[PDB]
């Protein structure tokens, strides 16, 4: 459509979006920071080990109250988690982007995740019931996601 960071040559690259995905924003953001720059095969293998809890996701900015993991010293950091829903929606989008590379004739064994970002999407509203007859918001924080897979070897 209209992305941030159009690729350096729009012939050796493909792309995919996803809008109003109901993941958390903060958990999807730290997952995408892990995936940025990885080769496409390494990223898929990594993102399925988050769902099996063999390799963690280092939470760096959004980390208040996040516990400390033994797998996180691999990333040079202390605290980490294993976001399952954030990893699964980043596998649907990545499989989508891989098939966008086969529609336009690229070798998908050389793709590298160049650009990735998540944005905050419009919030969804529910309600919660509190002590002395009060209603509070119980909002949700969905996300937009976009990525560019430029191939290089």
């Amino acid at each position: 459509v209209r992305y941030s960071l159009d690729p350096e040559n729009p012939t050796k690259s493909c792309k995919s979006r996803g809008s109003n995905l109901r993941v958390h924003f903060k958990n999807t953001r730290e997952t995408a920071q892990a995936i940025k720059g990885m080769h496409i095969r390494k990223a898929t293998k990594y993102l399925k080990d988050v769902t099996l809890q063999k390799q963690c996701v280092p939470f760096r900015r959004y980390n208040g109250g996040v516990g400390r993991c033994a797998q996180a010293k691999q990333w040079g950091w202390t605290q980490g988690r294993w976001p399952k829903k954030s990893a699964e929606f980043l596998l649907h989008m990545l499989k989508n982007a891989e098939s966008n590379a086969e529609l336009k004739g690229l070798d998908v064994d050389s793709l590298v995740i160049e650009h990735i970002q998540v944005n905050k999407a419009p919030k969804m509203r529910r309600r919660t019931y509190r002590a002395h007859g009060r209603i509070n918001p119980y909002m949700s924080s969905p996300c937009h996601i976009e990525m560019i897979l430029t191939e290089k070897e």
Partner: peptide, 25 residues
């Protein structure tokens, strides 16, 4: 969400009442 004016009035009374019981002049 709807905010009820009365819930505040009731709470205020409790706070005022609590101050009187807890405070000796």
């Amino acid at each position: 969400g709807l905010q009820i004016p009365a819930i505040l009035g009731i709470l205020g009374g409790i706070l005022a009442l609590l101050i009187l019981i807890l405070n000796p002049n």
